[PDB]
Design a protein around this nucleic acid. Sequence first.
RNA 1: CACCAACUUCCUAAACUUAAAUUGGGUUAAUCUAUAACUUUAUAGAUGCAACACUGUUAGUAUGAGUAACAAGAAUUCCAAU
Lengths: 264, 144, 108, 292, 166
Amino acid sequence: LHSKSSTWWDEHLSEENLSFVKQLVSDENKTQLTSKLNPLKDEPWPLHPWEPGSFRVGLIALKLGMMPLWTKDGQKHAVTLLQVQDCHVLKYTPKEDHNGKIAALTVGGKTVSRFYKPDSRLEFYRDLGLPPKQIHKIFHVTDNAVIKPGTPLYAAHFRPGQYVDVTAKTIGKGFQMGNQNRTVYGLKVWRVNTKHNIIYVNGSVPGHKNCLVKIKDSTLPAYKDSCKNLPFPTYFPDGDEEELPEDLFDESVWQPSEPSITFA
Amino acid sequence: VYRRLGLGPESRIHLLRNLLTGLVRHERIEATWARADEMRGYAEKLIDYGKLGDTNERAMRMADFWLTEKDLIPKLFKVLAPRFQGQNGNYTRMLQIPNRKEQDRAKMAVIEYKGNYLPPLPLPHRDSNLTLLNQLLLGLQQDL
Amino acid sequence: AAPKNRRTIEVNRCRRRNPQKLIKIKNNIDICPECGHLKQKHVLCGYCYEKVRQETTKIRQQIGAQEGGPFRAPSVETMVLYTGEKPSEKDQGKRIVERNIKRPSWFT
Amino acid sequence: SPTELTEMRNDLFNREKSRQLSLTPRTEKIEVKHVGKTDPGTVFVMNKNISTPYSCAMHLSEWYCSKSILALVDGQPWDMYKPLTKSCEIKFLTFKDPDPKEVNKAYWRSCAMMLGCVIERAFKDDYVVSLVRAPEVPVIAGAFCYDVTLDKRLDEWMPTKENLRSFTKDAHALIYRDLPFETLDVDARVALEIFQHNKYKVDFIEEKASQNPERIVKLHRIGDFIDVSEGPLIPRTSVCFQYEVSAVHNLNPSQPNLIRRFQGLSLPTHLRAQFTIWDKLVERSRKMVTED
Amino acid sequence: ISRKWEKKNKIVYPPQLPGEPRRPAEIYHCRRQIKYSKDKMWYLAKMIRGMSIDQALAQLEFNDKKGAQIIKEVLLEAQDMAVRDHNVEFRSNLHIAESTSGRGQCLKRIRYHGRGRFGIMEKVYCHYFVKLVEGPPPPPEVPKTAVDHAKDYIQQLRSRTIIHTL
RNA sequence: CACCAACUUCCUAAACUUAAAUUGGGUUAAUCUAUAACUUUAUAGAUGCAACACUGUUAGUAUGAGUAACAAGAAUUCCAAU
Ligand SMILES: [Zn+2]
């Protein structure tokens, strides 16, 4: 029949070629990620000093789960685990062209396979030089804090002791429900694991385990300007002004291998 | 992790027991796709029990209960288990068959034990490397 | 439950001719090289599969006659041999099934 | 003007068709037996030099027409639209055959011929563009190559990214046009006259005439454009699904004329490729391809 | 009962002159008595309208409804007679010009109920009408572009005629 | 410092005055007879002579509706098989 036929990427791939295709895909992912490792060495846009009223960009992270965390006071606090995976800046929108009040930056993480995605999405990412990301989210960022697209974002952008706002889609329960975007406000960060980009956040976060979430600085009036004492645009490992510890702890948090806490 | 089958939990196992016994006897059974998928895991684990050893007392209790016909019990430990010693898994091959034309249009599948003496099933074949697209991919592979 | 008035054919015609209620076309139809008949991309050919089952029934019939009794499943491996093929030393210690037909071309 | 050459080229192509039609008197019945794997042994009584393999495909089913790109007449590759000549054994070739190497060559040659058509009409009539030949390169090379000699005025001009895209637009339009590949076997004397102005085409006609005992040469026509062919070509231009003009490499010996070898890649509808795979293939098709 | 669909297949056109184009073949085939609802058969008929002979056969082969199997048999019969009697040279060169279903004579029975009630039992029968035209199916419709729509509106404004004036 | 608006009124052609039981008068569809007519008509004489409506009667076909609704233990080597 002179009619359309349904095809998949593996339909016409032979076993020998199929194995090669997998190797080629891995090579492309490695090369693209390495090229984007150094943002400051890739003609970075000018970075401006902090002033009151500036807003930093947010990140997208994966919810590993929850585990118990102890403080130096001996109390046990359940903490949720958030992992930042392949977080990169993708598209910058000018202040006028997006919203007269403030500009926005698009950030996507959690790289995904290219086999089962539309060519349009791949075309945009090919220009960006990065592999496709699972989720695209828009973050309001002031002009001074704008960062060139393709800059890798890491969990070190946030720091222990900082309250943060996490919004994620709630678990769907079917006809009975759920599956609605919700935000939890005022969650403190207990610890950050730089090597695996894991942020330890007080309290529970909406959604199932392994569910992508959007993380942005706390918008509560009390924490209006916390970025003054934090990396103002973001944390750049490329700059390497001072290498951060692999695991970042809050002062109250009792690190493992510390002496047993005695209530004296 | 389990399909809701049978008038009760016992019926599912008894029905699975009936299905398992038939497959061992014949080594190739045609049944509804859902049943074949559900029982595929049991068949693979049963082969592991055969691999565990004939002397294993626990295997006999499992084999005795699951296999109503006791002539199969020697077969499992002396035919199925020796056959699959080299294999580390994938003992059962399950393929989708066109739905039954019995006015209910049930989804059909065929489950067989690999290494059997029965004629080979008409398995699907991937495209040959001689194809133009594969030949082009071969050139790219050679250059890299 | 009946509407307070008869439903007009015009109203009814629109309901049944809405695209949601019409039969959809399928584009996943494929050809089977083995049988030369049609197949679905995710469904195996039945014309060739029918041959396998028919041969299986014939093979099973021969086994049943050879066993000669119920609950006589051997504890030893089984093998099938066709006319023109004779039991070999490798076939020793395995139940041997003899088929009057010659070795089928598809069967190896 | 190039348009005048196409007009006279088209006419001689048409007159040759009439002469061949007049050459055959009446309709002669030839018994062609289907040796194809599927439905083997069917015998069609067909009109000699009139019936084509496509007609036989029409007789059987539409599936045959869609999936058949070539025909094996007595074990010889025959174009789907080439009139049958005698009682023979006919088999249909598809892109998914176990050994499509014969099909690959026909697709390879047809793609090169399509590229040649784009070049001649891409440039303005003011400039002089002469097609030299279509080099034969393996499919493994990753790109099909067409050689063309430009005028001195274009010696300093190299296609830009937009210019390359323009070439693809012409090629894409040709595929969209879906022009069937007309096939004619013509003697050298007529063929030389048809391409008398292009001296490079003249020698290629002589080479083909030299190889065979007669002077008959294989001429293929896409619309107005006509070209010589080393072998059988694709029935229609619509077969190609993806088309790209990867790059152009200028041959170093450009003193008499600047000989450019253009690199392109194309894929049939039967063999679609993923976006990333196509991108890598296009990148791999931008490298100079030598003939070995 | 009326059987004029068959009579449409018995129509014989006058001999065409040498300077007259070859008339496209038209085949009228129908199954008068089918133990099936016409409405259900109509749904199958509606989808297959305008499709090619090969495409319709392929779609029917993988259809789950009983009516679809009946249509395939009817379609296969129509194709056979078309080549046998209507001089269809190529089997593939056929398309479904028309496909529709009609009501058939039914049977009347009373449906008893276990608790003293009763119902009206009816045995439904239907007719199936198809006309097949030799040749490929006609090309599908192309939606109007913005330019086409805009031009018509301007033409309509120009086409306006003044009302009840000298 | 006007205009609009009713068949009120005027104007051309015409017309000659505004609820409902009841009461006077002139026609007519259809069928048949007498006697004619002869693409379907006339003069007389007749009648089972005209129905959107009698808890009216018979037949056809819709709507609710393709809705309510309904159904056979497993495998195989096979429905008087295991
Ligand atoms: Zn097959």
